Amino acid sequence: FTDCQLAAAVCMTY
Amino acid sequence: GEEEERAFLVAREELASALRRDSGQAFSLEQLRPLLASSLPLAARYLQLDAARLVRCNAHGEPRNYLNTLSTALNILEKYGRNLLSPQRPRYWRGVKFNNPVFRSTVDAVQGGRDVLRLYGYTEEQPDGLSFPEGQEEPDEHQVATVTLEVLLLRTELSLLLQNTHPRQQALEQL
Ligand SMILES: *CC(=O)Nc1ccc(NC(=O)C*)cc1
Ligand SMILES: [N]
């Protein structure tokens, strides 16, 4: 994945 | 013996304080040299993370592959700790749900990835994931900063092993 897919996904699990 | 350990713990506390000062700070390989070029064993250098278990229990297949799956999990786990130290935390930071494709492919793809979230403060086992206890209203900055630094340091150590430029590569390769 890209670094922005990871950050956006982090906010998705909240 | 205890002097090399003392110098490590002092440098660990110094770098963890800078994380609290700025949660988006990027550390150079020079700033991490006191933490990278250390002869101390893993148990003396990783006080919160279980580096040996996270690496050996996930060492299955080729090192090119599982060291990378570990790095991606450590990368996304670092962002979890950095958001907790941010001056403007995310809205629902208190809980983390697991039914996400990226989460399944990163954190839930390595053994012990969920347990790193416990070190941040997500100790309440919920149906869909983990959450902070009902008592705490804000995360412990010192605990989050030290765990985020250890997650950052381990990802750095694994990245140098993949580049074959680790200062103690031969010792770490023998897990
Ligand atoms: C490229 C990049 O930095 N992207 C990015 C996307 C999302 C977020 N944050 C959230 O979704 C909360 C940060 C960075
Ligand atoms: N969430």
Numbering used by the authors:
A (entry chain C): 4 to 17
B (entry chain A): 3 to 177
Show sentences the authors wrote.
We began with the E3 ubiquitin ligase RNF31, which is an integral component of the linear ubiquitin chain assembly complex. RNF31 is a 1,072-amino acid protein comprised of multiple folded and disordered regions. We screened two of the nonenzymatic folded domains, the PUB and UBA domains, each at multiple concentrations and in the presence or absence of a known binding partner. Most hits for the RNF31 PUB domain could be grouped into two families of related clusters (C41 to C43 and C44 to C45), both of which competed with the natural binding partner Otulin, and both of which appeared to contain a critical tyrosine residue – also found in Otulin – but that had otherwise dissimilar logos. Upon solving X-ray cocrystal structures of member from a representative cluster of each family, we found that two Helicons, FP06649 from Cluster C44 and FP06652 from C41, bound the same site at the protein surface, but that they engaged this site using completely different binding modes, with the critical tyrosine residues oriented differently.
To target disease-causing proteins that are inaccessible to small-molecule or antibody therapies, we are exploring the use of a nature-inspired drug modality that exploits the intrinsically favorable properties of synthetically constrained α-helical polypeptides (Helicons). Analysis of 14 high-resolution crystal structures of Helicon–protein complexes across six different protein domains reveals a range of binding modes, all of which are “side-on”, i.e., mediated exclusively by Helicon side-chains rather than involving main chain amide interactions.
